[PDB]
Write a protein that binds this ligand. Structure first.
Ligand SMILES: CCCCCCCCCCCCCCCCCC(=O)OC[C@H](COP(=O)([O-])OCC(O)COP(=O)([O-])OC[C@@H](COC(=O)CCCCCCCCCCCCCCCCC)OC(=O)CCCCCCCCCCCCCCCCC)OC(=O)CCCCCCCCCCCCCCCCC
Ligand SMILES: CCCCCCCCCCCCCCCCCC(=O)OC[C@H](COP(=O)(O)OCCN)OC(=O)CCCCCCCCCCCCCCCCC
Ligand SMILES: CCCCCCCCCCCCCCCCCC(=O)OC[C@H](COP(=O)(O)OCCN)OC(=O)CCCCCCCCCCCCCCCCC
Ligand SMILES: CCCCCCCCCCCCCCCCCC(=O)OC[C@H](COP(=O)(O)OCCN)OC(=O)CCCCCCCCCCCCCCCCC
Ligand SMILES: CCCCCCCCCCCCCCCCCC(=O)OC[C@H](COP(=O)(O)OCCN)OC(=O)CCCCCCCCCCCCCCCCC
Ligand SMILES: CCCCCCCCCCCCCCCCCC(=O)OC[C@H](COP(=O)(O)OCCN)OC(=O)CCCCCCCCCCCCCCCCC
Ligand SMILES: Nc1ncnc2c1ncn2[C@@H]1O[C@H](COP(=O)(O)OP(=O)(O)O)[C@@H](O)[C@H]1O
Lengths: 100, 38, 458, 319, 344, 47, 97, 119, 55
């Protein structure tokens, strides 16, 4: 037979290091590889990130447009103009193909 | 449990003077390693 | 956007220079913060998109992804610390670097103004991925899987190369900004009808369409967990991002040149969803789940209605996170079980109480439970598809019923029923396994609170 | 490194060959007196003396020179050769193939000393004589036919390039008397060896090795009595005329290329690693990777000679 | 080789291409081609193995008849124009025969059969000189006659070489044979853009030289003429496994590496000139070339083939340091795509 | 140590001095070229 | 002159067909190969002579000098072949397949 | 191109290239060439089996400093070549003006691109 | 201070990238500064003792 190794068993890392956190076999590296992963993972990304993302102001202008509507609807209604006129680019500006 | 490293048989195919050997194409056997013929 | 990128490059020096024992924590801890710098791009207080500089830009469609691409590198490096912890200390530092380059390249591809910059970076991502799948792939067939993943993408890629060089001559620059504000209206010739297919086909291939999706089941099967996460979460979505930015040109033809794909995808959605119903390999079932839920996306990036695109952007980010979560937990069962078979390992909740809660939430994300971005996404694509033709609900209606069935079957035959008598005893759950999951779902819960951020360009 | 430049600007081996400059090798037979005569012939004629090739001869050759672990040296046991003939794992063929590689290294190191220093060479058994062990092994059940073909292929590919032994000495003692010589030798593995197997070894020499080398190189046959008398044998060597043989055509410009070969050990045995996959020879990727990824981590071996600090190398930052 | 002879030959093998390039009198260009033919034949039979004599006798007959055809073109021109050199007026057949003969010398496509056979049975070092240094002298003549040669003839010569080179590569497992089948394809890309952008013809050559020269000095570092032989690279010398991987994928057109630029700009120039028929088919089968490149990748790097026990012995003795330039051109190849604008 | 000593154990002090010294000649020519260049550019054009 | 040039040119093509259609012994080929050099030498000399272009007569001979050595190399390969096979038939030159 | 008037038959960079600005030594490209070089050096050490980064610190320098040296003087030229291209291109546009007339597109108001509805 | 043995030599690699990154992204601005304040929607006139609108 062609020489090759006998199947390597998978160790019960939980037999020694009964506090195994799943990162590395020797205990101190494990502890310091979860004390830095829960922290940088949860403690300052899911928390500081969500804080910053929550405070992004008027994202994509949708906080601005609910007022500009309100003053346009305030202005258009009181002055009697149609609230959403039916052509946007004014007809006067357009130079329609004359013949057709 | 071991990413399967190639066995002898997987290796075998790459021998032979042509990868895809057809009829009267397997007749060809690999050239001498020394580059010298008998 | 060179903080999301330069600091990333520097990760490579850190994976190499750092101590063999401390290499893992330096890399994972630092890219978590790299994700935090990525969050700055989300600060868009105005419609004008952010053109950082000539070559690098980020608009609503790319920003939700760049953050996901940066987010998964930490997770990928945490899910592969177990397998790949049996290596020689230089095989690891190669795997870690390979994972690092994927998001460096993927961050740039998603944040690229010039479409051919997309192509060069687009097709480069195959190099890192093929190495991850072939070199560390457990099964005898990864050499084959790698071939399938390289050729299907490559044969699609060279047509796009010819097409983009073609439009540069026709218009005079491949700059996505200009191409948008310039008049490029195809003329429904027979040739243009080919151009359109040339540009979309390469994107349609890596976004598995029903016709060419055989590469994805084969690739994720033997791929290591980190490669399977990357393929499902970021790699497949590269095809969707491309279809959104490339169909700005080729505006007139897709009105009538899409029918073929749309029907291929919706019928494909049903058959891909159904074969999930009886597939013995769990990783196999998640992969076909990925094909079907991505077949919905190619059917919304082609109908081209504002809501479709918005549904697509919602679903792509959401399904990306969910799929990985499913691929990540599949791996945890695979490593203790040592087999991909779904029938073995029955009853796990009895022995792994929490992983089962993660399994349940992942499945509910997989099927459309309502207070989830996953449902909002499908609800929207469903609406537009209905607008395209009221009949579409029938086919997008057989998929919803099937999607419920396979999603729960994964929970019912893997995480319930009587425990398997005595497989190699299943060691308890590591805290890494559980966090790798928590890190996937906690963002899924947070994004569902404010869906606006992943809402697309439309 | 010795190179044409040296040659163009000197370094012509032709200007260093003396009357005693020859490749003398005593093929001998097992437990015979091959070594004593050799060490002596070396002593009186002033020729370099090279010991019989060993499992760890290559390790003594390279780097520290401390003996390597068995698996690092190819996992070959002459000891296991004897106690377990026709073994399932084939340690006997692996032993023979490593032995051929070891003498290939020894013969090449010998030729390098001969062409550089000009001191003549005594190396005991040679690659040319190695075949007798395999012939006897195939004669009995030790090795199967293909195994033989694989050794012959390696021999045909590498041995012709090297120049032949100038003269060969044959210290012959009969099949029965070597076994009694073996009997008082202390090791038990040498004892209990097949009389017929020893029969096949010396028969293979007499039938093939001598006559073969009779035409090509100066073949001197000595009986045991002539042996144990290094003086007389030495005398006869000094007596033979080094004429017949391929060595006659070795002009300086021809030696240069041969020198540059032996000067490169990685080539000397390049064809020794030919990718012919017979089962005994195959490392196997998982075992081989571990053995390499372990041999390469030994102190002074991680990096090239001169660059590994473990053993005390310095100046690496400017080398 | 008496070092004097080595000098005379090597000088001729080097004066051969240089006279061709420097002179304008075609005649002097022909003898430059003639000297290259005479100088290469001695080196080809250095081992003098039975395979070698076959190699040289083929190379010589193929080279000689082509040389005679090139001379006939010059002789004919001399009577259609007193000049000893091709001009706008030159009869089209005069140029076409020149095109066929030099393609014969380059073994570009229809005459591609001689190149794999000649490359097999000659030492790898001479094989590198045959595939790279010998090729420059014929193309220098073609670059000079750039405007005159007809577009249709070389376009089909180019498409034929891409197809034959790619097909030859998949079946061949003989490493040196594989190097020849890529050079036929790469030569096809070079001539495809020859009537259009000669600068790009040259670029597609240099890059081929900066790619093939490292690749061959890699094959010989372990002197492996078999893929099985290069596959055990992981045991003999592990570091070259990384760059051998990238250089071979660079030889094929994959985008991050330097190898994409030659194909990319040739395609850009052909589309600029409207050959979007021809360019497309070329790029597509160009993809076939990568398949056989990656199959080798598989055997040498991505998968570890089993090795013989004697390999441990070769690891022991100190390894031959690879050449200083192997390292510089290995990084020059595979890593200079960011420097592409200045290259063209 | 080694039975067969390395050829590189004590540095090839020539290879240092032509490697170090060559590079320092490169810079002093390169930096010179730039400032010299900048000037030529300035005077050849307006400034 | 044009008629003579036609004959010489076809002579070169008939010699071309010869060297491109081997049959047994190689020495035939090399011999044919030489038939071309003669035809080229004759044509070059002829036109140079009726163009009174004396500045070019050097060429007719340079052609022969280079062609002679070219042939010398060719024959040494031929002798090398019937030393390794001893029959000089293009037939046995197939090891490289 | 060649044949262009005044062409220097074998020169590297004609003095006319003096007029162009010199490449800033820290131009990203020259800096790349530097890194390209350092890597060559590191690679060499690796292929020759030496401590990768702690060896040949003299060579490291030769490499990073050879590649860079080459760059400034190459880029200096490639820069010129490109600059010639404009001199040449822009000039022609004028000398042959009629062939490159200045089109005058109409404000969208006037032009009427057809509208394909998505519906 | 650059404590060795991967003490601060390495830990400062990635962070430094960030700074360099920010140094470039604020340098890109410096280049793309035409239309500094010449845009139509935002073309205010310079307020007293203010050098330029956006830097
Ligand atoms: C990596 C790509 C590098 C590209 C480049 O350097 O030049 C691009 C070239 C110059 O860059 P740029 O964008 O013009 O820079 C302008 C900036 O404003 C900067 O201009 P500036 O005015 O600020 O210049 C001042 C200078 C001042 O900074 C310094 O140089 C100080 C010294 C820094 C040393 C850093 C050592 C680390 O800034 C720099 O030079 C450093 C820039 C980054 C250098 C490369 C770092 C990696 O133009 C491009 O960026 C386009 C090409 C981009 C890459 C396309 C190809 C991508 C796929 C291939 C990737 C490469 C590897 C090959 C494939 C994989 C093989 C294994
Ligand atoms: C096999 C895979 C490829 C099958 C065909 C793919 C699609 C066509 C080629 C790639 C895409 C493409 O760019 O084709 C368009 C091209 C004409 O380009 P177009 O912009 O219409 O120019 C019209 C000028 N009046 O029209 C063409 O390029 C036709 C190309 C025909 C050959 C296709 C490749 C065959 C490979 C074998
Ligand atoms: C970004 C692109 C994608 C990136 C993916 C990966 C990113 C990982 C790294 C970054 C992680 C943090 C950033 C992403 C999360 C952002 C969270 C967020 O934006 O919260 C906003 C919310 C304010 O609400 P807002 O939408 O502004 O108000 C609406 C006014 N009309 O502020 C809050 O209310 C915070 C509340 C915290 C707790 C909320 C829990 C609510 C759960 C509700 C659903 C429960 C059921 C879910 C079922 C799911 C089933 C699968
Ligand atoms: C655009 C990016 C494209 C993708 C880039 C990343 C992938 C590059 C392609 C890799 C192809 C080969 C993959 C398999 C290689 C296997 C190498 C191996 O097995 O390791 C052994 C080798 C030699 O070992 P040695 O260093 O002597 O020490 C250990 C002795 N046993 O030691 C080694 O070979 C490992 C170390 C090699 C040198 C370091 C290379 C690390 C990867 C650097 C990637 C940089 C990516 C930059 C991305 C930028 C994107 C714009
Ligand atoms: C519909 C729309 C398009 C959808 C995609 C269509 C095109 C898909 C092309 C790739 C399909 C997947 C790969 C198919 C080829 C393949 O699997 O190759 C394996 C086969 C046997 O390979 P073997 O020699 O055993 O070794 C391989 C390395 N282990 O190797 C072979 O037998 C020969 C394979 C040749 C290479 C085929 C793939 C590249 C094709 C390039 C030319 C394309 C047309 C021009
Ligand atoms: C991207 C490459 C970034 C390199 C940063 C500096 C790396 C370094 O200083 O060297 C150590 C690094 C890790 O060492 P390793 O490859 O495992 O082998 C060590 C044998 N003494 O070894 C390396 O340098 C690996 C990178 C080598 C160059 C790869 C280019 C592709
Ligand atoms: N290829 C081989 N086959 C069998 N035995 C070998 C081989 N190579 C070396 N040997 C062993 O080397 C030994 C050398 O013997 P020697 O030193 O003369 O006396 P002793 O037998 O007392 O050691 C032999 O006995 C033989 O067993």
């Amino acid at each position: 037979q062609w020489q090759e190794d006998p199947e390597p068993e998978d160790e019960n890392v939980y037999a020694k290091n009964p506090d195994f956190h799943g990162y590395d076999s020797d205990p101190v590296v494990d502890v310091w590889n979860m004390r830095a992963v829960f922290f940088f993972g949860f403690s300052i990304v899911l928390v500081f990130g969500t804080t910053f993302v929550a405070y992004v102001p008027d994202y994509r202008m949708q906080e601005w447009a609910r007022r500009e509507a309100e003053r346009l609807v305030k202005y258009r209604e009181v002055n009697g103009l149609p609230i959403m006129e039916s052509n946007y680019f004014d007809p006067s500006k357009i130079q329609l193909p004359e013949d057709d | 449990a071991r990413q399967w490293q190639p066995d002898i048989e997987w290796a075998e195919q790459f021998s032979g003077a042509v990868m895809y050997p057809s009829k009267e194409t397997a007749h060809w056997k690999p050239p001498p390693w020394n580059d010298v013929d008998i | 956007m060179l903080k999301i990128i330069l600091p990333s490059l520097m990760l490579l020096p850190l994976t190499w220079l750092s101590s063999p024992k401390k290499t893992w924590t330096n890399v994972t801890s630092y890219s978590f913060l790299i994700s935090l710098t990525s969050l700055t791009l989300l600060w868009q207080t105005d419609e004008n998109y952010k053109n950082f500089s000539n070559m690098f830009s980020s608009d609503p469609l790319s920003t939700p992804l760049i953050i996901l691409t940066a987010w998964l590198l930490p997770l990928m490096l945490m899910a592969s610390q177990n397998h790949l912890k049996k290596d020689n200390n230089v095989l690891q530092k190669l795997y870690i670097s390979m994972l690092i380059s994927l998001q460096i390249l993927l961050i740039m591809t998603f944040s690229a103004t010039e479409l051919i910059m997309f192509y060069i970076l687009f097709e480069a991502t195959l190099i890192p991925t093929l190495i991850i799948i072939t070199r560390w792939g457990n099964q005898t067939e990864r050499l084959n899987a790698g071939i399938y993943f390289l050729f299907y993408t490559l044969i699609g890629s060279i047509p796009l190369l010819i097409a983009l060089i073609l439009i540069q001559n026709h218009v005079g620059t491949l700059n996505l900004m200009i191409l948008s504000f310039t008049t490029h209206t195809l003329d429904a010739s027979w040739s243009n009808n080919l151009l359109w297919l040339a540009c979309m086909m390469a994107f349609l291939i890596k976004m598995p369409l029903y016709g060419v999706h055989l590469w994805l089941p084969k690739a994720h099967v033997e791929a290591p967990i980190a490669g399977s996460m990357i393929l499902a979460a970021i790699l497949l979505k590269l095809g969707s991002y491309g279809m959104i930015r490339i169909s700005i040109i080729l505006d007139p033809l897709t009105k009538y040149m899409a029918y073929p794909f749309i029907l291929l995808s919706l019928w494909g959605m049903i058959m891909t969803s159904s074969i999930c119903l009886r597939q013995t390999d769990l990783k196999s079932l998640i992969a076909y789940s990925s094909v079907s839920h991505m077949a919905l996306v190619i059917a919304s990036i082609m109908i081209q209605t504002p809501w479709s695109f918005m549904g697509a952007t919602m679903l792509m980010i959401a399904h990306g996170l969910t799929s990985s979560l499913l691929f990540c937990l599949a791996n945890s069962n695979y490593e203790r079980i040592h087999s991909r078979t779904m029938i073995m390992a029955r009853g796990l909740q009895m022995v792994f109480p929490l992983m089962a809660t993660w399994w349940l939430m992942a499945s509910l994300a997989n099927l459309a439970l309502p207070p989830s971005i996953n449902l909002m996404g499908e609800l929207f694509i469903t609406m537009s598809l209905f607008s395209w033709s009221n009949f579409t609900i029938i086919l997008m209606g057989i998929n919803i019923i099937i999607t419920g069935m396979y999603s729960m079957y994964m929970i019912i035959t893997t995480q319930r029923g009587k425990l398997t008598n005595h497989m190699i005893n299943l060691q308890p759950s590591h805290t890494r396994e559980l966090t790798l999951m928590a890190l996937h779902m906690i963002p899924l819960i947070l994004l569902t609170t404010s869906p606006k951020l992943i809402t697309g360009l439309t | 490194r010795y190179g044409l430049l040296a040659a163009i600007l000197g370094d012509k081996t032709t200007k260093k060959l003396h009357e005693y400059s020859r490749v003398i090798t005593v093929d001998g037979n097992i437990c015979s007196g091959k070594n004593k005569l050799a060490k002596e012939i070396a002593q009186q004629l002033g020729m370099k003396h090279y010991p019989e090739a060993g499992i760890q001869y290559s390790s003594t050759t390279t780097g520290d020179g401390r003996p390597l672990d068995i698996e690092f040296s190819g996992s070959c046991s002459l000891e296991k050769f004897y106690d377990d003939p026709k073994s399932n794992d084939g340690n006997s063929y692996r032993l023979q193939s490593w032995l051929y590689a070891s003498r290939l290294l020894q013969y090449a190191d010998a030729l390098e000393h001969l062409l550089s220093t000009g001191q003549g060479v005594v190396l005991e058994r040679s690659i040319y004589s190695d075949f007798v062990f395999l012939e006897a092994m195939y004669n009995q059940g030790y090795i199967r036919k293909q195994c033989v073909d694989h050794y012959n292929e390696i021999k045909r590919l590498t041995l012709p390039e090297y120049l032949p032994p100038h003269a060969v000495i044959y210290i012959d003692v009969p099949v029965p008397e070597v076994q009694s010589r073996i009997q008082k030798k202390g090791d038990p593995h040498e004892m209990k060896v097949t009389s017929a197997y020893l029969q096949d070894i010396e028969n293979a020499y007499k039938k093939t090795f001598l006559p073969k080398m009779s035409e090509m190189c100066e073949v001197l046959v000595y009986d045991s009595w002539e042996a144990e008398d290094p003086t007389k044998v030495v005398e006869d060597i000094e007596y033979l005329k080094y004429n017949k043989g391929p060595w006659l055509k070795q002009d300086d410009w021809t030696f240069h290329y041969l020198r540059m070969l032996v000067q490169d050990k990685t080539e000397v045995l390049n064809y020794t690693t030919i990718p012919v996959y017979l089962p005994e020879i195959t490392i196997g990727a998982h075992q081989g990777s571990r053995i390499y990824n372990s041999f390469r981590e030994l102190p002074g071996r991680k990096y090239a000679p001169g660059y590994n600090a473990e053993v005390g190398d310095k100046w690496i930052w400017l080398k | 080789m008496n070092p004097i002879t080595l000098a005379i030959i090597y000088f001729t093998i080097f004066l051969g291409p240089v006279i061709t390039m420097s002179s304008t009198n075609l005649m002097l260009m022909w003898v430059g081609l003639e000297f290259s033919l005479l100088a290469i034949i001695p080196m080809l039979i250095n081992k003098k193995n039975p395979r070698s004599t076959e190699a040289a006798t083929k190379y010589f007959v193929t080279q000689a008849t082509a040389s005679m055809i090139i001379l006939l073109a010059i002789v004919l021109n001399y009577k259609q124009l007193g000049t000893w050199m091709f001009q706008q007026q030159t009869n089209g057949l005069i140029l076409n025969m020149t095109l066929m003969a030099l393609s014969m010398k380059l073994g570009l496509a229809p005459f591609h059969f001689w190149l794999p056979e000649v490359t097999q049975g000659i030492p790898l070092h001479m094989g590198l000189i045959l595939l790279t240094w010998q090729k420059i002298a014929p193309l220098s003549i073609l670059i000079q006659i750039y405007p005159l040669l007809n577009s249709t003839i070389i376009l089909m010569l180019a498409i034929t070489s891409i197809f034959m080179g790619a097909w030859g590569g998949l079946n061949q497992t003989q490493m040196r044979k594989i190097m020849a089948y890529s050079s036929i394809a790469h030569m096809g890309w070079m001539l495809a853009i020859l009537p259009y952008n000669p600068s790009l013809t040259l670029l597609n050559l240099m890059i081929y030289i900066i790619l093939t020269a490292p690749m061959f000095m890699a094959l010989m570092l372990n002197n492996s003429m078999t893929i099985n032989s290069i596959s055990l690279l992981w045991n003999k010398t592990p570091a070259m496994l990384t760059m051998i991987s990238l250089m071979l994928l660079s030889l094929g057109g994959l985008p991050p590496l330097t190898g994409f630029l030659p194909k990319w700009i040739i395609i850009t120039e052909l589309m600029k000139n409207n050959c979007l028929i021809m360019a497309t088919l070329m790029a597509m089968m160009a993809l076939l070339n990568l398949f056989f490149y990656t199959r080798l990748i598989y055997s040498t790097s991505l998968t570890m083939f089993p090795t013989n026990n004697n390999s441990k012995m070769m690891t022991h003795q100190t390894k031959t340091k690879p050449n200083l330039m192997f390292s510089t051109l290995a990084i020059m190849s595979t890593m200079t795509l960011p420097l592409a604008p200045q290259l063209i | 140590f080694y039975v067969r000593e390395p050829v590189n154990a004590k540095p090839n002090w020539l290879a240092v001095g032509l490697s170090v010294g060559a590079s320092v000649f490169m810079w002093i020519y390169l930096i010179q070229t730039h400032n010299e260049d900048v000037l030529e550019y300035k005077r050849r054009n307006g400034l | 002159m044009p008629s003579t040039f036609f004959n010489l040119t076809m002579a070169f093509s008939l010699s071309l067909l010869g060297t491109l259609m081997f049959r047994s012994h190689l020495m035939s080929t090399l011999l044919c190969l030489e038939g071309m050099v003669l035809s080229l030498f004759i044509m070059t000399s002829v036109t140079s002579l009726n163009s009174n272009s004396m500045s070019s007569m050097p060429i007719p001979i340079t052609i022969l000098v280079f062609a002679a050595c070219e042939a010398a190399v060719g024959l040494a390969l031929l002798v090398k072949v019937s030393n390794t096979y001893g029959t000089d038939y293009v037939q046995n030159l197939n090891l490289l397949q | 191109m060649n044949g262009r008037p005044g062409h220097e038959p074998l020169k590297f960079l004609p003095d006319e290239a003096r007029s162009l600005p010199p490449p800033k030594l820290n131009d990203p490209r020259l800096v790349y060439m530097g890194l390209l070089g350092y890597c060559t050096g590191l690679m060499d050490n690796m292929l020759r089996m030496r401590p990768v980064m702690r060896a040949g610190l003299h060579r490291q320098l030769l490499f990073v400093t050879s590649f860079v040296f080459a760059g400034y003087f190459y880029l200096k030229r490639q820069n010129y070549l490109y600059a010639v291209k404009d001199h040449d291109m822009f000039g022609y546009i004028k000398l042959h003006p009629e062939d490159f007339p200045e089109k005058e597109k109409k404000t969208y108001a006037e032009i009427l691109e057809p509208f394909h509805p998505v519906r | 201070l650059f404590q060795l043995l991967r003490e601060h030599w390495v830990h400062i690699l990635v962070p430094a990238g960030f700074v360099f990154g920010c140094y470039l992204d604020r340098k890109d601005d410096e280049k793309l500064t035409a239309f500094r304040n010449k845009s139509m929607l935002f073309q205010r006139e310079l307020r007293p003792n203010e050098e330029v609108t956006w830097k």
